[PDB]
């Protein structure tokens, strides 16, 4: 219970107890059954003084738990700036990878800690490191609302999916248009002004028009059709956009799709027409329109 | 705006998972433990087949083995069904169709037991091929990123969820597992029925060199998206 007391002393932030346990020869590198060490616990929980004394006694700054996480990963995720600073000054690998491939810079960008992003960059963080799913720190900042961090990363030459080619696609086959289809009209418009291909299908077969129909954005549906979207795209998806609009009760979208040539006879993988799906989902107003469609 | 149940997830929450399984008559039990932090959408878990050798590939059980830990951004808090049903919890039911092979049917309850978030599942698998990819253990020990689609089910006071899992096969091909999911609250309090949106997932599977039993170490990050400010 000596390493267990120290692990517990580090977890609980017991500065004096850590101090005492270590004069008795407590293993500064004690690890629990998932590879968590006192330094992991202190860094994760924001215990600066404990971090400093563990490092004093030879705590391994780059110890990895079962999930590949080092103390720097945990401190960068939690926003503990001073701890991040002391781990780096004491030899932490600024580009260590968790089991997904995230570096500390990924995690700080994902979590919104701008000052931590800056200090990781100062210490040699790879601005364009990719996790195993292809994401850069810029991708994680920008897809999750951290515009201030995204700008810092771009000033440090960080890029991301679609930063050079509007028709690039990510791990799941999403282009910039697929991401923008979820209600970002101005972005959709800008991408189309700049040559984005409206007909791109993701890894499940979905086009941007499928996604806009699913999410109920009429004006995005309209602009994608204006730019030549296939109104009846299915292929591997298993549904056309009209099927989706019928399931979810999007009457104005149904009307636009019909005006643009949507096929009332298209069957999904269960044999259902849009009319059948409107009936099955309690959207009799859409069923009424569909059976009268021009 | 924000549900009362969301307050239970402001920090790290311990997790327990218990799964009772029967696939083509092969019975097994899996236990998991670890923690989740919805602040970051992060799970750190380890699972053990306590009965012996797991008779299906570990990847095929990942989705069955706690979507209340997804990170919902502030502008989407009113769309987080999963936390709104806490602490009383929700029932999560799925059918998982493995293309050109059998299916899993699962029923789980996800709820607080004291301060621990607990996922208790019963799984039945039928019609598997004896030397297919599942019973033949031909799936890579790996996992992909997915988009998880979430819709309200007003009649049931819950949600419907649909997605396709892609399992890499040892030869380079992909085994599709088509997921049909439904969640309903256990309790009687108000819950949040969301507008249509998605979750984006990342996972990594690994092994513990000090674990002698058949097991899976899982790191997972999930974030909600698709509704604009």
Numbering used by the authors:
A (entry chain A): 13 to 306
B (entry chain B): 0 to 64, 68 to 231
Quote the authors verbatim.
DARPins are engineered proteins that consist of 4–5 structurally similar repeats that stack on top of each other, forming a compact protein domain. DARPins combine all potential advantages of single domain binders over antibodies: they are small in size (ca. 18 kDa), possess high biophysical stability, have very high expression yields in E. coli, can easily be genetically encoded for in vivo applications and are devoid of disulphides and hence well suited for applications where they are expressed in the reducing cytoplasm. Structural investigations showed that these DARPins bind to different but slightly overlapping epitopes.
To connect 3G124nc and either YKKD or YRLK we chose flexible GS-linkers. Therefore, two linkers of 7 and 11 aa named GS7 (GGGSGGG) and GS11 (GGGSGGGSGGG) were tested for linking 3G124nc with either YKKD or YRLK. The resulting four constructs were named gc_K7, gc_K11, gc_R7 and gc_R11 according to whether they contained YKKD or YRLK and the linker used was 7 or 11 aa long. The complexes crystallized under various conditions with different unit cells and one to four complexes per asymmetric unit (AU). All GFP-clamps form 1:1 complexes with eGFP, in which the clamp indeed wraps around approximately half the eGFP molecule and creates a continuous large interaction surface, similar to the superposition of the two parental DARPins on GFP (Fig. 4(a,b and c)). The buried surface area (BSA) of the GFP-clamp complexes is 1625 ± 72 Å2. Between 7 and 11 hydrogen bonds were found in the different structures. Hydrogen bonds of Trp79 from the GFP-clamp to Leu44 of eGFP, Trp79 to Leu220, Gln81 to Lys41, His114 to Gln204, Asp143 to Gln204, Asn156 to Arg73 and Phe226/230 (numbering for constructs with different linker lengths, respectively) to Asn198 seem to be the most crucial ones, since they are found in almost all complex structures. Whether the linker is visible or not largely depends on crystal contacts; e.g., the linker with the clearest electron density from the gc_K7:eGFP structure is stabilized by crystal contacts with a symmetry-related GFP-clamp molecule. All linkers that are fully or partially modelled exhibit elevated B-factors compared to the rest of the GFP-clamp if they are not stabilized by direct crystal contacts.
